[PDB]
């Protein structure tokens, strides 16, 4: 009958500079011979060809497909990806959402700490030097 595909992780949150691996799977009989990945954009969905910008990779086996995205960019990479598997009896699709965390949130306890140190130094340096 018709195939039923599902994502291993429906939503992921990786960070820039790394490489995300989204994977869809299916257990229908007959197995899914071909898989295709599309990136959702406003009013249109663009196919993800292997080797694009030397950073995309697609690895497909019977009923399972991995989408590797290297060097996570903050402008084009985050969003929704659609995997479509077409068995001899039909086709199905799954939706995976990917977010890219930046270094702003990653180096959060570094800026926080140095800011707090600065504030402390200003507080003590005005509370004593001129006020006291």
């Amino acid at each position: 009958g018709p195939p039923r595909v599902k994502a291993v992780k429906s939503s992921e949150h990786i960070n820039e500079g790394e490489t995300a691996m989204l994977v869809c799977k299916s257990e229908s009989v007959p197995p899914v011979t071909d898989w295709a990945w599309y990136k959702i954009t406003d009013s249109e969905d663009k196919a993800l060809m292997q080797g694009s910008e030397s950073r995309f990779f697609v690895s497909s086996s019977q009923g399972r497909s991995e989408l590797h995205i290297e060097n996570l960019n903050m402008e084009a990479d985050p969003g929704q990806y659609r995997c479509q598997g077409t068995s001899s009896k039909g086709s199905d699709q799954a939706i995976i959402t990917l977010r890219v965390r930046s270094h702003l949130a990653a180096l959060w306890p570094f800026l926080g700490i140095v800011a707090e140190v600065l504030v402390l130094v200003t507080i003590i340096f005005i509370y004593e030097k001129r006020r006291k």
């Epitope: 990786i14 790394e18 691996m21 292997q50 497909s60 086996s61 019977q62 590797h68």
Partner: antibody, heavy 112, light 112 residues
């Protein structure tokens, strides 16, 4: 769905050596193959992987020391310069979700 | 940079019928692509769990993988004598960049 390694033997340091893994019950164009080695009484070392499209990726510590290739039915792993520290059992494994199907393994000894 | 897996503890024991746990800690986010393997002495390893939680085909329910992110844990219950073997975890998250390095290993000794 099975595989079978061959080519394990004793060789002198420096002499190259090629191991062959013959698949059976599935095509090499629809599944990837991993090469994993294990020293006597030690853990498993992941060597490299060759995808269905043909791309080959090697471990950081193993860059240059090995070479993976494949034909329509077998995968070959060539060692360009084996050392004494290269004696281990080498397994080939079909990659679908982790390594499910594994081979019996062939033993490669490097000594004088 | 290849991801390194820190498997602890090295050894773990339990009586027949008990429950053991094994923890694997990844050097980086390998959120859900970790497989667990059971290798018996002499025989080749056999895949036990894929995607850190899905049970492999023809595997008993006694094995239960849990965890995500960088911390994973495998647990066995009703420890039979046929469970005495070494267990290994393995990351396979974006192998083309971080490899598929294996864990140190965990020898599970039953206490009869």
């Amino acid at each position: 769905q099975s595989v079978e390694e061959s080519g394990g033997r004793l060789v002198t340091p420096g002499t190259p050596l090629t191991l062959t893994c013959t698949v059976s019950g599935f095509s090499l164009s629809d599944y990837a193959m991993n090469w994993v080695r294990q020293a006597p009484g030690k853990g498993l070392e992941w060597i490299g992987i060759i995808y269905a499209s043909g791309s080959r990726y090697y471990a950081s510590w193993a860059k240059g020391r090995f070479t993976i290739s494949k034909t329509s039915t077998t995968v070959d792993l060539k060692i360009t310069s084996p050392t004494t520290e290269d004696t281990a059992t080498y397994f080939c494994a079909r990659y679908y979700a982790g390594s499910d199907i594994w081979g019996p393994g062939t033993l490669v000894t490097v000594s004088s | 940079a290849d991801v390194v897996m820190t498997q602890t503890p090295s050894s773990v024991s339990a009586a027949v019928g008990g429950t053991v746990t094994i923890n694997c800690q990844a050097s980086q986010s390998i959120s859900a692509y970790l497989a667990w393997y059971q290798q018996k002495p002499g025989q080749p390893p056999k895949l036990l769990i894929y995607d850190a939680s899905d049970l492999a085909s023809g595997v008993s329910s006694r094995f239960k993988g849990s965890g995500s992110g960088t911390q994973f844990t495998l647990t066995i219950s009703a420890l039979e004598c046929a469970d005495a073997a070494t267990y290994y975890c393995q990351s396979y998250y974006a192998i083309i960049t971080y490899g598929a390095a294996f864990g140190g290993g965990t020898e599970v000794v039953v206490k009869r």
